[PDB]
Design a protein around this ligand. Structure first.
Ligand SMILES: C[C@H](CCCC(C)(C)O)[C@H]1CC[C@H]2[C@@H]3CC=C4C[C@@H](O)CC[C@]4(C)[C@H]3CC[C@]12C
Ligand SMILES: Cc1cc2c(s1)c(-c1ccc(C(=O)O)cc1)nn2C(=O)c1c(Cl)cccc1Cl
Length: 241
């Protein structure tokens, strides 16, 4: 078949092997919600304990996105500088997109440590405005009801972005980007789902939310640092250290 139909296939496979939580599991557990008492239990934890828990979960989620990127056709062929630039700009944007699969718009809950809970679970972090923004962004995306294949192709394009500042081989990121844009557009046409294009988040909004998120993470890491066994050291070193 066409290069483009094979690329649709390699991206969707990459996503399925690295999606971290299975959509069917997430959907099934929606009814499994934290009680008043369990919520109070989380709210009473120190900011230090809640940070340790949340940092760990976020680091693990980033590591699935790194593995996703490393399985995208052409990514490993980029110079290591460009692999770092794309993942440093993009990997947390992909996590915030992946969150919509684990988010229930009906009751504004997210799947966290085995059950669904609202943003007030995270009270002890003293991050309410930022956490509210992250929930609202997921609330936005949920209205699309992304298919597994749409989120695979969309999140590939979140990463493979030739406009990221600092790319050494910009022409080669463009070639990859053009093919992934064609794959996504082709797939939406084949599935009668072009309607989602007008509804995708403004790009500026994903960038500024995620930029705020990573700045807060870097402040917490500076105050109370957790240590990570880095899946991709060169990238980590430009984030931890
Ligand atoms: C919004 C809250 C709190 C963020 C706190 C802050 C601002 C200090 O980072 C975070 C904490 C843990 C996060 C989840 C961790 C892992 C996953 C799985 C991945 O497949 C999709 C995203 C998700 C559900 C994260 C969402 C954001 C969460 C709840
Ligand atoms: C754009 C990116 C943001 C971001 C990335 S990438 C990573 C990360 C993680 C692991 C690896 C690896 O190689 O295993 C590499 C990179 N952490 N991280 C954070 O914001 C972060 C998190 Cl999630 C938790 C605690 C502290 C911090 Cl600072």
């Amino acid at each position: 078949l066409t290069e483009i139909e094979h690329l649709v296939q390699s991206v969707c496979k990459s996503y399925r092997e690295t999606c971290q939580l299975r959509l069917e599991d997430l959907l099934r557990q929606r009814s499994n919600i934290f009680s008043r008492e369990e919520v109070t239990g989380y709210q009473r934890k120190s900011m230090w304990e809640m940070w340790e828990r949340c940092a760990h979960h976020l680091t693990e989620a980033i590591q699935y996105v790194v593995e996703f990127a490393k399985r995208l056709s052409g990514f490993m062929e980029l110079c290591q500088n460009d692999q770092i630039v794309l993942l440093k700009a993009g990997a947390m944007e992909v996590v915030l997109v992946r969150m919509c699969r684990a988010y229930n718009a009906d009751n504004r809950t997210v799947f966290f440590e085995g059950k669904y809970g609202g943003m007030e679970l995270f009270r002890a972090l003293g991050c309410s405005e930022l956490i509210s923004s992250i929930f609202d962004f997921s609330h936005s995306l949920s209205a699309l009801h992304f298919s597994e294949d749409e989120i695979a192709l969309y999140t590939a394009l979140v990463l493979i972005n030739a406009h990221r500042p600092g790319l050494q081989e910009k022409r080669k990121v463009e070639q990859l980007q053009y093919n992934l844009e064609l794959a996504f557009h082709h797939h939406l046409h084949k599935t009668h789902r072009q309607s989602i294009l007008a509804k995708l988040p403004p790009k500026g909004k994903l960038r500024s939310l995620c930029s705020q998120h990573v700045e807060r993470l870097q402040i917490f890491q500076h105050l109370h640092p957790i240590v990570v066994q880095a899946a991709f050291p060169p990238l980590y070193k430009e984030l931890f250290s």
